[PDB]
Write a protein that binds this ligand. Structure first.
Ligand SMILES: Nc1ccn([C@H]2C[C@H](O)[C@@H](COP(=O)(O)OP(=O)(O)OP(=O)(O)O)O2)c(=O)n1
Ligand SMILES: [Cl-]
Ligand SMILES: [Cl-]
Ligand SMILES: [Cl-]
Ligand SMILES: [Mg+2]
Ligand SMILES: [Mg+2]
Ligand SMILES: [Mg+2]
Ligand code: NA
Ligand code: NA
Ligand code: NA
Length: 326
DNA sequence: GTCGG
DNA sequence: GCTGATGCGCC
DNA sequence: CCGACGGCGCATCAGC
């Protein structure tokens, strides 16, 4: 793609800052620069040209100058040749191992998948699951399979109570031809900002999905969020489907539009949308859009009747989910 | 790492 | 148990 | 050691 060299470089640096340096703001700066550069509709011919974009400063402009001149960056060469860095970065790819645990493990000489397997007693349940399905979770899900999964989920939710409404969000709702995982937004009339009437509204759905063997394991679970694992059933003498990650989020029904905006993403579109909201004097989360009063504190939630209404408050032209991907 | 108070 | 900080994760 | 930077759910740890 156009300017793919540059956005790959900046992404790789981003992941280094997050996973090795533990520098989440440098991670976020590298993410933002890559984002702006990717939507820039010309070939970047210099770092100066790039510097003009919001989120590109001197140091990134200089890196872009090097890469444009040489087709590589020495900094990233050194990082790739550092075995310790590589090991730490690699371990964070296990679901449940973040930058902190990855550094702890590598400090104790645990550097490979083999090592994690030999030292399974050192892992929490989440991590054990991340490891068990490490290969599967590296793979994307074709949209064809996402359709089957949607259909299993909607049907089983329908069977618990026909008043539930389940919406597959994330990259799927953005129309992607493959997805990293399944993200499901769930609402029920009994759960609103004003009132929780039923207990166990999420629980009911999860247990039903476990009962039909769709959901296979649980990473974490509370009253409104479920993180876990699921699997399509497969046909005889045909290899199984990979196990997949699934996220379910129960949102107050009167807050559907804020929730579906959050859960549709992308992640960087969300952060950028929320960033623009702050400079417009608003704050947005998955529940509400609120005005910022001086003293910092946010005021009452503003009424919202559509996804677009949230765009309106901050004066962004509406973006279809298609055009919310990076 | 970048931008803005 | 609490409050608050950290570590994991989600978009 | 200019500080903010998007915002939060679930699990767990420190200091009560
Ligand atoms: N864009 C910047 C740059 C620096 N600082 C901070 C860092 C210091 O804690 C404080 C005062 O730094 P200086 O004395 O360097 O700023 P001066 O304006 O006094 O420098 P000069 O003597 O160049 O005019 O401001 C800031 O708030 N915003
Ligand atoms: Cl940082
Ligand atoms: Cl809403
Ligand atoms: Cl809120
Ligand atoms: Mg997803
Ligand atoms: Mg997800
Ligand atoms: Mg994601
Ligand atoms: Na810039
Ligand atoms: Na991880
Ligand atoms: Na509108």
């Amino acid at each position: 793609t156009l300017n793919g060299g540059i956005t790959d470089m900046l992404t790789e640096l981003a992941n280094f800052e997050k996973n090795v340096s533990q520098a989440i703001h440098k991670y976020n700066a590298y993410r933002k620069a890559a984002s702006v550069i990717a939507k820039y509709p010309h070939k970047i011919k210099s770092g100066a040209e790039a510097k003009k974009l919001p989120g590109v400063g001197t140091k990134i402009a200089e890196k872009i100058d090097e890469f444009l001149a040489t087709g590589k960056l020495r900094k990233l060469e050194k990082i790739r040749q550092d075995d310790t860095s590589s090991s730490i970065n690699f371990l964070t790819r296990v679901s449940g191992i973040g930058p902190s645990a990855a550094r702890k493990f590598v400090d104790e000489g645990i550097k490979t998948l083999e090592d994690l397997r030999k030292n399974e007693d050192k892992l929490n349940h989440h991590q054990r699951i991340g490891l068990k399905y490490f290969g599967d979770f590296e793979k994307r899900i074709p949209r064809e399979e996402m359709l089957q999964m949607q259909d299993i989920v909607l049907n089983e939710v329908k069977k618990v109570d026909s008043e539930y409404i389940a919406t597959v969000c994330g990259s799927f709702r953005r129309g992607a031809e493959s997805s990293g995982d399944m993200d499901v937004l769930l609402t029920h009339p009994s759960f609103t900002s004003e009132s929780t009437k039923q207990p166990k509204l999420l629980h009911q759905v999860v247990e039903q999905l476990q009962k039909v063997h769709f959901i296979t394991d649980t990473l974490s679970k509370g009253e409104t969020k479920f993180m876990g694992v699921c699997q399509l059933p497969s046909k005889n003498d045909e290899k199984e489907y990979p196990h997949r990650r699934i996220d379910i989020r129960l949102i107050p029904k009167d807050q559907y539009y804020c929730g579906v905006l959050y859960f549709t993403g992308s992640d960087i579109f969300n952060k950028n949308m929320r960033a623009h909201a702050l400079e417009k004097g608003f704050t947005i989360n998955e529940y509400t859009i609120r005005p910022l009063g001086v003293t910092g504190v946010a005021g009452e939630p503003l009424p919202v009747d559509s996804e677009k209404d949230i765009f309106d408050y901050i004066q962004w032209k509406y973006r279809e989910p298609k055009d919310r991907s990076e």
